[PDB]
Amino acid sequence: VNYLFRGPVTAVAAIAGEGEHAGIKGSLTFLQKSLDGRTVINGTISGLPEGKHGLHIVDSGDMTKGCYIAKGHLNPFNLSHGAPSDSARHVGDLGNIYADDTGISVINLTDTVISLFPTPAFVIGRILVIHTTYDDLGRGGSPVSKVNGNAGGRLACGIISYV
Amino acid sequence: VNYLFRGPVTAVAAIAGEGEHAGIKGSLTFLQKSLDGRTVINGTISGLPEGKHGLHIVDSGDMTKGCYITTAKGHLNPFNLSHGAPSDSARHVGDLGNIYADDTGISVINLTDTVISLFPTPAFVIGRILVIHTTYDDLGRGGSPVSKVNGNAGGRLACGIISYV
Numbered sequence A: 001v002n003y004l005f006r007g008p009v010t011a012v013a014a015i016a017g018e019g020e021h022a023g024i025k026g027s028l029t030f031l032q033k034s035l036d037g038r039t040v041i042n043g044t045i046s047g048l049p050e051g052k053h054g055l056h057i058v059d060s061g062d063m064t065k066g067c068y069i070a071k072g073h074l075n076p077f078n079l080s081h082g083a084p085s086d087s088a089r090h091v092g093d094l095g096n097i098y099a100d101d102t103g104i105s106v107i108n109l110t111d112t113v114i115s116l117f118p119t120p121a122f123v124i125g126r127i128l129v130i131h132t133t134y135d136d137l138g139r140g141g142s143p144v145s146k147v148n149g150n151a152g153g154r155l156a157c158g159i160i161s162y163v
Numbered sequence B: 001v002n003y004l005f006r007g008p009v010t011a012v013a014a015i016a017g018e019g020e021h022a023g024i025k026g027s028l029t030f031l032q033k034s035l036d037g038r039t040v041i042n043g044t045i046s047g048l049p050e051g052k053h054g055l056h057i058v059d060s061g062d063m064t065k066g067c068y069i070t071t072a073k074g075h076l077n078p079f080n081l082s083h084g085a086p087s088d089s090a091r092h093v094g095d096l097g098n099i100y101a102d103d104t105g106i107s108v109i110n111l112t113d114t115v116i117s118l119f120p121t122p123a124f125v126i127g128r129i130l131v132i133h134t135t136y137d138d139l140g141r142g143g144s145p146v147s148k149v150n151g152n153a154g155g156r157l158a159c160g161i162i163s164y165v
């Protein structure tokens, strides 16, 4: 067969900011037991400004020019931007994470759309982004609401890679 | 129908060292036109010590602890073969041989490989770490115990995850 389509798949992302945001650091683990199965995401990020931050997988995995410079959420199904719980969403739409006054965000998410297996929703080799502000979940009535949730610039990112 | 199996694929690795090796910086591009096509690898790295350095893809993509882990994972080897040169019959998928850095610390990388894949076939290299070693790969011919394991290329100077463009 192909070992990439087999057994449980474990992935990780090393999250880092740069420049003024060099203090932003964290790691996420992704586990999907089977092709049909949900993906569980767990980890922490530290050094974040207090409040909600959009968490998105973009269509590129290219970190050669750093975090702060293609744009577009991972969207192989050509849908509009939405919340993770919305049917009308990008593959890359993982919603919002929250950091308190400590700057620590605890991430514990379950997703049914992303894949750790090489199906069209494969997220490995793509960049996970933590945005400046909150994702409006396509409900904000901004022009870019249905494009990217109006979550502003990037604070930090990391490539989703195999464990 | 699966876009991951179609068209030409371009992948990239952002290469960085850390600590004393923070001056090592570069990028490699990988381009493969189709399933079973050759993969052309191009790039430049700066800040390297002069001489030959092993260039290998390891079985892990985990950068959470940085490049200089105490994990000693092993070269990407889904076909369960011994370590060799890229042209050798017996080689790991991850065995891309040696790069050369000149006295200015610049390495110009220009390789073509017919084993690795940018498509999700058994030799898929995306989501794994590309490593630049301390010293040269002996291509499994050095008579060391680890020669047939990893080419005795020593520790790591720098690395990066092979990712989609």
Ligand SMILES: [Ca+2]
Residues within 6 Å of the ligand: B036, B114, B115, B116
């Ligand atoms: Ca081949």
Ligand SMILES: [Cu+2]
Residues within 6 Å of the ligand: A054, A055, A056, A073, A129, A131, A148, A151
């Ligand atoms: Cu976004």
Ligand SMILES: [Cu+2]
Residues within 6 Å of the ligand: B054, B055, B056, B075, B131, B133, B150, B153
């Ligand atoms: Cu090696």
Ligand SMILES: [Zn+2]
Residues within 6 Å of the ligand: A056, A073, A080, A081, A082, A089, A090, A092, A093, A147, A148, A149
């Ligand atoms: Zn989106």
Ligand SMILES: [Zn+2]
Residues within 6 Å of the ligand: B056, B075, B082, B083, B084, B091, B092, B094, B095, B149, B150, B151
């Ligand atoms: Zn090897």
